[PDB]
């Protein structure tokens, strides 16, 4: 995705309120397989799978328009994307604990993408997808064909 040349139409898209608010993880599916595919061993899988997750999306207190804040509170981790826009690429610390290049993008009007690109190894990327389904935020994570769907409800 790259539309730098003439981005007046895609200047800044404002997050649909469907993705906004605080969501607590209800359940997930095929998460272990995703972890294996992602290259996480048993130890990591013992962490990652047992990590409860709370999503927080809000208008960015940065004081600007269109921007949004998003943090990923878990049991063992914690990440806080201060002031980001969809289609925007910024540096920050992801769940993987490093401070690397990250990009968000509204790919469809019901699915946002979170892509983590490590400064050290940009090939060991990782992508989450924020889909809406019903009154739940449904995350889709796919690696090596392995899709895992994490079902988040509001708080
Ligand atoms: C599943 C990818 C985990 C990447 C970081 C692994 C090291 C830290 C341990 C556990 C991570 C907890 C978060 C798991 C992914 C949450 C995805 C999400 O819903 O945003």
d(CA 47, CA 56): 21
Q: Which atom of ligand 1 is nearest to the CA of 150?
A: 19
d(CA 33, CA 141): 11
- As its CATH architecture, domain 1-155 has Beta Barrel (2.40)
d(CA 16, CA 119): 30
Check the CA dihedral 98-150-129-109 and report its sign. Answer: negative
- Domain spans, the chain: 1-155
Q: Which residues have C-beta within 8 Å of that of residue 52, sequence separation ≥ 6?
A: 24, 25, 74, 75
Per the listing, tokens 């979170």 go with 114
DSSP-assigned letter for residue 14? P
Provide the token pair at 147: 């899709």
d(CA 49, CA 62): 33
Ligand 1 lined by 74 (C-beta under 6 Å) = yes
Closest-CA residue, ligand 1 atom 5, reads 96
Ligand 1 lined by 146 (C-beta under 6 Å) = no
Contact 74, 54 (CB under 8 A): yes
């Amino acid at each position: 995705m790259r539309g730098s040349h003439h981005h007046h139409h895609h200047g800044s898209k404002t997050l649909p309120d469907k993705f906004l608010g605080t969501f607590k993880l209800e359940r997930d599916e095929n998460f272990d397989e995703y972890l294996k595919a992602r290259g996480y061993g048993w130890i990591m899988r013992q962490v990652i799978k047992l990590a409860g997750v709370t999503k927080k999306f809000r208008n960015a207190a940065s004081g600007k328009p269109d921007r949004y804040d998003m943090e990923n509170l878990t049991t063992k981790k914690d990440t806080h994307h201060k002031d980001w826009a969809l289609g925007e690429e910024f540096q920050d610390e992801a769940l993987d604990s490093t401070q690397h290049k990250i990009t968000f993008d509204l790919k469809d009007p019901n699915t946002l993408t979170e892509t983590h690109i490590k400064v050290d190894d940009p090939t060991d990327v990782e992508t989450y997808e924020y889909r809406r389904d019903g009154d739940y935020l449904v995350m889709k994570m796919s690696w090596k064909g392995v899709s895992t769907s994490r079902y988040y409800k509001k708080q």
